[PDB]
Amino acid sequence: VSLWERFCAWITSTENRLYIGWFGCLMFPTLLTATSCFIIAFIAAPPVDIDGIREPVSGSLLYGNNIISGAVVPSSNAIGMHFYPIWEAASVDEWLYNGGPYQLIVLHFLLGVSAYMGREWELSYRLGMRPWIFVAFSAPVAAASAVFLVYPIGQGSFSDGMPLGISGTFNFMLVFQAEHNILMHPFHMAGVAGVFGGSLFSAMHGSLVTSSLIRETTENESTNYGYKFGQEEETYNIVAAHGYFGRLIFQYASFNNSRALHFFLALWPVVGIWITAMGISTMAFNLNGFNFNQSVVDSQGRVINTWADILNRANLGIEVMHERNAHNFPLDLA
């Protein structure tokens, strides 16, 4: 029994409180350096020019921000795509001026969350359960990597990434409405149908199970105590929930199989958020949503306006305002 025998048996030990595993050799020291820089940069980071115009933007709490208006800014436009670690600044004064701690948090979020995917698998292999939960977690990883990496990659700079803050994400959404028109993008329409229908079916499947519950408790006790942990009897009636819900819409639709049903719960949000994450990231490479401006034309030739035109009149309002001095030239190519 080697020293490496007492080690690998401990790393892949299922008896630990929190599983470490071999992805946790990546995940823990990469996520702990992303939380720790985030707590420090959200509290104490000095202001940063996002636009490379030398107008710094105050993100931290100590310089007069709220929790909602505060953020961790993205890097400088002047950096661009360049890997900008601490050691390639000349001082940490300068690293924190140019938006250094964005790349420190983002590149460690996305290694640690990718390593949080494998750990969801690696333990599902260690406990003998069917190993596909991490494929459902692929949809937020797809979504986060499209917003923090691929949209910076497609647009040329990390300053285009989403900033790490509540009012900061709202700035990211509006500017991405103007140049890109995400609302008229069906890859965005599909995943809002995965978030509406996602929380539709979570409310449905929650209300059909909790309606058909079998009598164990009294009036004076929570109904959750009718389920002891680790039972062998089903805690509710499938036949009464299905007989309810079949009369709610259709007999032949609204089907029987409680095992095929939870696959449909697993599919419909995850397939939706895969599509928006490819929706953001094709438009990373500037392939925008539907442009129906001045399409409806009468016999004479004059543009008849649609609801698309007042939609793209919003985008003109956000276009002429976003980063209003960083532009020196008429078209917004960069």
Partner: peptide
């Protein structure tokens, strides 16, 4: 002086999560 109140509540939630993971009521099979 409200950045005190902000960091007290943010660290406040981070404390509550720490007790919620490591000092939880364990479920038993029995």
């Amino acid at each position: 002086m409200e950045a005190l109140v902000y960091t007290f509540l943010l660290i406040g939630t981070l404390m509550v999560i720490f007790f919620a993971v490591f000092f939880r009521e364990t479920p038993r099979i029995l």
